Task: structure prediction
Amino acid sequence: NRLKEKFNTEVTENLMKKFNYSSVMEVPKIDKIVVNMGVGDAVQNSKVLDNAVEELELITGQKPLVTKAKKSIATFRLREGMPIGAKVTLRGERMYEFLDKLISVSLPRVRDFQGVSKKAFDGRGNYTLGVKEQLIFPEIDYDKVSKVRGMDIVIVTTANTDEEARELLANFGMPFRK
Amino acid sequence: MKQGIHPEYHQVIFLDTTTNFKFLSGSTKTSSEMMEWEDGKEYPVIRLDISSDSHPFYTGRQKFAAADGRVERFNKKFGL
Amino acid sequence: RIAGVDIPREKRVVISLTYIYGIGTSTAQKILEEANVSADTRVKDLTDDELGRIREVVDGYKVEGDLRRETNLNIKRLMEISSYRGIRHRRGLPVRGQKTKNNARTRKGPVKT
Amino acid sequence: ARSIKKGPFVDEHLMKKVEAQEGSEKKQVIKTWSRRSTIFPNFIGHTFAVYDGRKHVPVYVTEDMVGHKLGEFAPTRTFK
RNA sequence: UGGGCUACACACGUGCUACAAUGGACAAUACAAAGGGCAGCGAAACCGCGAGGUCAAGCAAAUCCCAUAAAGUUGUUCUCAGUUCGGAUUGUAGUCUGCAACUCGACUACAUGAAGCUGGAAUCGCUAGUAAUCGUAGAUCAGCAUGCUACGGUGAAUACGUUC
Ligand SMILES: [Mg+2]
Result:
């Protein structure tokens, strides 16, 4: 619980001092992490989705939930109810472990890493990170992976504003592009 | 968590070989090599070429100096 | 993995190092000599201590993203200053004074009869 | 001159014209037929009217332009 | 004086280099001919990764120098792929000539690493020291050759025959 321990002690102290929170409950926290992989290629080949599912299962350590198309789009050759993606929701200990690994190992492994974007906030204190390849994650092996694929990592924070969210992520040690 | 639907996940020690930084976090990676920890337990060790401690961006270390200006290079090159 | 690149395991390390941007045959031979790692040993048969030794040396050389970024800026500089060379970079025509009545296909792309 | 031992080549008339212009802030255009002359650090801020073979074309030196010939920044051929 | 003759959506002729294992790289080790040279050829030595630089012997020639041929031979390694094939292109840092290499030179180093997997219709040369292949020299010439003109090394296949 290294990341959790920091949050409980060091991060909480920094945030409450910074924003003059009246109560400890006010202090922002990361509610959940959702990893989404969109696989439109799955329409062309079912195997592509299967390979993605395995990769996400390895990365997160939990079985992904296959996502089915809400609607049919002719341009994408998409039919409603077709499996075109996979998602995992990480909560509790699993979330902290994944996040610490991302900052500690996976983000460093990113090729030509120049820090993460500071502008990637929804305006409601929620941050989304896009990874170019899943090779960055330590578990994934280059030989095993037939096709390099990107992923969306959404970090949902209880923080009302981006600035409070930015502080929380900075305290966690998330690199920022500045 | 549902039983039998999730991949085996175990605490593993991630070691930065370059800076000898050790941290314990969960992973589905299995390592034949195992290392002792501060707590009285032994975990499989995953070796990392680079990490937050070693990575240049995180450190802020400048591996290479900035490119010289056109005026600077001209003067330096011909000694003028 | 060296300099952010997963080099081919099967090949000898002299050759495998050249699969990194900024490293060619000449540089690869130098880096192995400095690290005192044999050229013949295959990457699959490389040792962890040896790998670290190689990694120290490769850190010495500007490679991959670092070199790519530098090269692009020099070309961008030429284009911005409106140099003859820079203008030809913009036009996609031979920059180093080669004739264009014939040939120039690598720069011009495929034929457009 | 490409060889380092020889200095960068500049026509004396061009260099002398620039050197006289050093004193006054309000620089005036320098007409030149010297496409061959190197752009020195001293040239920065000056506008040279370099001949293209038919007309003198205004060329204004910037920092990046140092080390390149004056001819490089005035075209001799026209296409489309 | 400067620019152009060096343009570039394209079409054609003649060449150069490849598409690898009858090869690539590396190392060791042989065998030519025909030419050129006075302010020109320049050795050896030292320095540079190298292109070169420095100093300078000999030599107006069966004497000295250009100038160690290369393919070859014997090993080592790679192992059938866009690669340890190929080397276009581009970046950068140099060398040399010259008054000056921007337009627009040649060469080097490092990096970069295109097309190309043997070529549709069609079409060319060659009957033996020939073709093929490998290097060598000269004229022009400050520098600048995949061209031209010469040179030797290795060295084939096939020709029934004259209907077309
Ligand atoms: Mg002509």
